[PDB]
């Protein structure tokens, strides 16, 4: 789409307001609103200003002003606002030089796409993502000198089977979801069919191409909705809008959604599986009839890159402390760095898609939805490209239940990282693959390490955990 | 606009009531209502009476009667009243001589504009204002012999993360705003989108030219809406009308708004930044390609005047005891008398606007919304004009995060005043720049000093602060 | 008294524990307990260690170890502890050189007495103090992001005349104390006769020579108990023990005492009037039958010193933010700097004592109990001695109600400081009178200033006051 | 041994005196966030033939070579020794700056921010000692005291020189200065990993045996480290619910 397309949409829809959006470093979309009357060619030619110092990972206070220029391909009508609103994503630019900003996540994605072309390896990188989430009824939490707590709740949570009444006083009618039992019985066991239909419809009406929706494994309202894959930048923009549409459809219907990796102890985490494939000149590159799981050398070496670089790569794909509570055995998330066809205990699964070369792809199952998809997709691509360039051979696939390996076989397989501080430490020590062609710059990597250490790792580390009192009060 | 235009508007809108408004000295608009049937030429010819002894800063009881003459430019339909009402601002006049009143804030702004033109320096002073505010749910407070309290509350306040239910008993659904984290994530973190759209719509339907609206930095529903700049008197009239529309939009939708400078301890205050520029014969005066931050000699001298006179000027721009709780480090409000491009820790920031001479301006960040915009804007202009007349050179810009200076280096730059009594004392001792051209008169200045001492400074000073019990109960 | 006298007291009283006490810089006594078996000659010869970095105004963490040596004159049996305990005060010493510590308040008092002797002016400075206090039932307070409160309560408090029941559910029986009506009606209006008797008895049994006890002016249980004057250091040790006996007699009897200067708004504060006189070779120096109020030149000049140095001296005599809430008119506390016989509105009153030269003395009415009496009494003495030495003539006595002076007359009389930051600034600017003879050192004065700014002034200044909500919520 | 028997009985007496009087006592290293943790500082000295060994008037802080080398052993072996002296997950919540507990491996006279403080005891040779400030009460005093002894004795035997004392507030050092000093361990799993890799000083003379060391490592991993690691922390909801 072009600027005039967007002006025509706004006029055609009788839009009242335009919501100007961009991505902060950690991965939350930021916005402000302008009236339809202020949305003119000047928005495209000169841009709009904001306080870069109030956005995480961006500017210091004395260098605060930043600029925004619109991306007309991202213009969509907002399904929630009573006053008719057009949402458009923007790129962040330096207000003096007008150059793209080194810490604009959307810029990283753009650079990644252009670096791919420049290598000659492929022209298009397709990302099909599965961002699971929980549909809860309530959450509360706090952290004080003498105590701390959290509690999430959901009508369908198995912890409520014994409740005398529901939250609102109405009767307990049963049909709650057993732990690991939500994938995927029919209603009334599935208590969220109507709400997910609203989610699906809102996505459809926002121009998503829908594939499917279902309850997921977790008790207390785990869900998954799939939309069609796209090329990297478009997929990442799609992910951000999807999260917005999911969260607000829930909110408007009395619920509260979370995309955090592991809100429930002892039930499935929420992943962001990323199906990936490279194409060049309109043809697939991932397929070879004679390869293990029908994979070409290009595909196998991409995988080699992901599994080789995982120790630093997870800093962008699994970027929170809570991420590492999901990387534990028994919940269809990864615990080690192996690939395998058909295998949901693996780090990379090769889904069964038959002999169609155009369907052949890898599913990187490690990532979760707790950070920034622009950065995560870009980092995954760079890992895979370094694998191809250096012909990195992944270790032999292991077609077994990886949670039930004998202790000795498990010992020779590199494990997933234990905690965020290890991946940040590793990113700091080796990130040359990310800086290739300037896709990630040193200031971005240094800002990310610093942000994670100061705002996440240390704040969790210094606070006593509730289970420490269960273990140690009586020492 | 003319009287006949106003009568036609009232006729065309089928107005039932006319609301007669004027400003008290501290800065609250005052009103009474007349029926449409009493709104005739006589209102314009002879005016309307009120009790000047019931208005703060006005008359003594034995000289009570005062007169009001309408300003037809200010006629606007009221958005809130069920009975269709037309609002009009009035100037206050002596009921014997019919001369403008020396303590009518609207008269001061009139006088300021005429004085500007008389100096030959410029013919127009443009003021663009950013009046931030909090959208709360409730407030309570008292002061007794043996105790005193206040509490503000907001569903989005971070202090409520641990709440078991919301005030109405419905579940806690999270997405509350972190302290200093409100600028500006998408919904549902931003819980006020629909309400701010209603504010924007009401402003647009009252004739404002809107620029933008967003959540601000503060937890608990801080917000900002910007409308287009105008010349001084119009801008001050807009400001008063804006406060009224914001407040009542909030009220009609179950909320309560404050424009107080510092309602929350440890989170952002609410400022009233005033972007200012001088024009003459339809051409800008602020721009010089060769100057630091693109500023002309005229612009620099105006800044020199603001920062030179700040010690007394703040008596009008930062006119409350609570004003000085905002002027503390770490919250994008000023703590010293520095100007600097791009710098949200400075007293005067030069926004980055490029090489367009018509956009070049200064942002005076010290002011807040706690007083009287007619007086604030007028005092700012008088300081600026004194700076120009005396060629007052500002001290060199300091392009640093001003909150992070070590103490010995912080001390080398002039600090903002600590408390209201200091700025009132200073105004008392030095105010000649304000009395130039008779813009502010001695009786205005003395009334202001006396009012603030007797009704604000002393009442706060004699009341034990709750934190004194924290410090001293056990002495 | 000697070490052997203390060992015999401990033996005779069958003491089980000894409580080692010393004074921190702000004025709170500190303690730890040793078993009687560890109270031996070594305590007198080698001293005892503590963590100087955990005591306010003392050491940094890398120079933390300090020493304590006993003062056998201060040994008394503790009235409250079930296990028979002997309390003894200690002097603080450098653990390397064993020299007295320059920030030990008990050392400052010591140094003040010896300085006095070294001048030849006198050999003894007597201090008779009247430390008023409130006997409350309860107190709570807090300070949060969105709110702050305090409340004190007392059965006799006038704010309770309308209570349907007492705190414990029993009936409201009336006879509550009117504001400013507590001095001093008979029971049952006085609801604390039996408790003040217990206070009197505990004091007597701890070796005080009692003079009187009574209800004071304030509602909600204001009280005063007076014991016989003593020379400076003894007087200061007595004050500290008195505060301890008062607070713990109340506590053991279900009440809670504060010595804060102004716990109630609109009722009397709590002062610490300090009657003072200089003697030499067993003869008085303050008397002259021909002077105004029978005052000698020595006495007049001492008064001169007090009133001249007041603007910095109150940094030690009136050392808290709350102090300045008491220094307001209408409550028998001072509001300006004069002396006057018989006059309870004055800063220095000469009590009516007749022709007895041995009774002649001044009452400095300004001081309160919110700080450190070692420092307070020492600073007063150094001011008076500077006055004697430089023959500072006080301005003429004003024998009138100083709250009710006409405006002209009042403005010709220097006022008391308005606030703590003003007296701290003044102390920083002029403290030579205090450093005379090394009695106060620069490190003490610097630590005091720094402590008050960082730990009291700034913390109150940054917190919104509840009355700011009353004034400004609706701005 | 008497000291470790004393410690166990003391804890029993404190806990039960509290309990019989309506209260409840904990010896856990960090029950309050943003206030002081609870340490178990261990003052230590070696004597032979009824004579003290720690004193030398001419040494820094009046310390002999034998004392200095004992300190060398403590600071050198600290990365593994803390498995016995700081043996719980909660231990590492205490080892954070601002609360008079150690954050790096230095000795210093008079210094409550250091790992080893030398208390000021004047010139009496029988009072001269070191205070090892890192340990807490969350484990086993028999094993902690024994492990500290074995560390110090290894220091004496190999004459391990400690790095020079730093007589400064160790929480406030400039970054370049701070980065040049070895830090205390961050978490239990780091000290357990380190103990597993190097425990020879402890097995000397068969004081600690391999079966005790291996049982300790396995106990901590299975019953403490892994159970806390797999449970979401409340503050993760504060940080991440809205991601
Ligand atoms: C034009 C690009 C097709 C990409 N292939 C592809 C497909 C796909 C599936 C079936 C297809 O069959 C149609 C055909 O070619 O006959 C073609 C493509 N599905 C995914 C999912 C994730 C990802 Br990543 C790639 N995917
Ligand atoms: C006609 C008066 C234009 C004043 N300039 C001006 C503008 C402005 C911004 C852009 C402009 O570009 C249009 C043009 O001249 O090409 C012109 C003017 N924005 C502000 C905001 C606050 C204040 Br104060 C002044 N502002
Ligand atoms: C031996 C010293 C007597 C000091 N005089 C003195 C007295 C006093 C009062 C009455 C006296 O009469 C006894 C006599 O000498 O006949 C003697 C002394 N009362 C106070 C109160 C506060 C202060 Br300060 C001094 N006071
Ligand atoms: C007989 C053994 C004396 C040990 N010295 C010693 C002492 C001590 C303190 C003072 C002493 O003085 C008595 C003397 O010898 O004159 C003697 C010994 N205090 C401690 C505390 C912890 C530790 Br570990 C050792 N301590
Ligand atoms: C059923 S599952 O294997 C569950 C994945 C799990 N929630 C995870 O943490 O990755 N997902 P899918 O079948 O959609 O790939
Ligand atoms: C984000 S901020 O810098 C916040 C200003 C702050 N509330 C104050 O002036 O106190 N304002 P803006 O970017 O609108 O000028
Ligand atoms: C009755 S009063 O004058 C009251 C003094 C007041 N409470 C003060 O604040 O100084 N005291 P006194 O008669 O005991 O000297
Ligand atoms: C006052 S302190 O330094 C406090 C020690 C702190 N609780 C710690 O965690 O080691 N203890 P001590 O002076 O008893 O050695
Ligand atoms: Cl971590
Ligand atoms: Cl003030
Ligand atoms: Cl103050
Ligand atoms: Cl651990
Ligand atoms: Mg799926
Ligand atoms: Mg799934
Ligand atoms: Mg495209
Ligand atoms: Mg999948
Ligand atoms: Mg703004
Ligand atoms: Mg703003
Ligand atoms: Mg006009
Ligand atoms: Mg601004
Ligand atoms: Mg008295
Ligand atoms: Mg009294
Ligand atoms: Mg004596
Ligand atoms: Mg008195
Ligand atoms: Mg024995
Ligand atoms: Mg110790």
Swiss-Prot record, chains A, B, C:
InterPro entries listed in its UniProt record: Gln_synt_N (IPR008147), Gln_synt_N_sf (IPR036651), Gln_synth/guanido_kin_cat_dom (IPR014746), Gln_synth_cat_dom (IPR008146), Gln_synth_gly_rich_site (IPR027303), Gln_synth_I (IPR004809), Gln_synth_I_adenylation_site (IPR001637), Gln_synth_N_conserv_site (IPR027302)
Induction entry: Repressed by phosphorothioate modified antisense oligodeoxyribonucleotides (PS-ODNs), which acts against the mRNA of glutamine synthetase.
Record GO biological process: glutamine biosynthetic process; nitrogen utilization; positive regulation of plasminogen activation; protein homooligomerization
Disruption phenotype: Cells lacking this gene do not show a detectable glutamine synthetase activity and is auxotrophic for L-glutamine. This mutant is also attenuated for intracellular growth in human THP-1 macrophages and avirulent in the highly susceptible guinea pig model of pulmonary tuberculosis.
Variant or mutagenesis effect after changing residue 403 to F: Unable to be adenylylated
Record key words, sorted: ATP-binding, Cytoplasm, Ligase, Magnesium, Metal-binding, Nucleotide-binding, Phosphoprotein, Virulence
Field pH dependence: Optimum pH is 7.5 in the presence of magnesium and cobalt ions. Optimum pH is 7 in the presence of manganese ions.
Residue stretches making up the GS catalytic domain: 105-475
Annotated positions binding Mg(2+) 2: 132, 216, 224
Gene3D superfamilies per UniProt: Glutamine synthetase, N-terminal domain (3.10.20.70), Glutamine synthetase/guanido kinase, catalytic domain (3.30.590.10)
Protein name per the record: Glutamine synthetase
Gene responsible for this protein: glnA1
Swiss-Prot record, chain D:
Cofactor(s) for this UniProt protein: Mg(2+)
Coiled-coil blocks: none
Keyword Phosphoprotein: yes
Binding annotation for Mg(2+) 1: 41, 131
GO biological process: one example: nitrogen utilization
Molecular function (Gene Ontology), one example: fibronectin binding
Transmembrane domains' residue ranges: none
Main location: cytoplasm
One cellular component (GO) term of this entry: membrane
UniProt modified residues of type O-AMP-tyrosine: 171
Record domain GS catalytic: where: 1-243
Chain positions recorded as ATP binding sites: 43-45, 112, 117, 126
Keyword list, A-Z: ATP-binding, Cytoplasm, Ligase, Magnesium, Metal-binding, Nucleotide-binding, Phosphoprotein, Virulence
Bound cofactor: record note: Binds 2 Mg(2+) ions per subunit.
EC number: 6.3.1.2
Induction remark: Repressed by phosphorothioate modified antisense oligodeoxyribonucleotides (PS-ODNs), which acts against the mRNA of glutamine synthetase.
Catalytic activity: L-glutamate + NH4(+) + ATP = L-glutamine + ADP + phosphate + H(+)
Subcellular location: Cytoplasm
Consequence of gene loss (knockout): Cells lacking this gene do not show a detectable glutamine synthetase activity and is auxotrophic for L-glutamine. This mutant is also attenuated for intracellular growth in human THP-1 macrophages and avirulent in the highly susceptible guinea pig model of pulmonary tuberculosis.
Function, in words: Involved in nitrogen metabolism via ammonium assimilation. Catalyzes the ATP-dependent biosynthesis of glutamine from glutamate and ammonia. Also able to use GTP. D-glutamate is a poor substrate, and DL-glutamate shows about 50% of the standard specific activity. Also plays a key role in controlling the ammonia levels within infected host cells and so contributes to the pathogens capacity to inhibit phagosome acidification and phagosome-lysosome fusion. Involved in cell wall biosynthesis via the production of the major component poly-L-glutamine (PLG).
Similarity annotation: Belongs to the glutamine synthetase family.
Assembly and oligomerization: Oligomer of 12 subunits arranged in the form of two hexagons.
Name assigned to this protein: Glutamine synthetase
Species name: Mycobacterium tuberculosis (strain ATCC 25618 / H37Rv)
Gene this chain is encoded by: glnA1
Residues of the full protein shown: 236 to 478 of 478
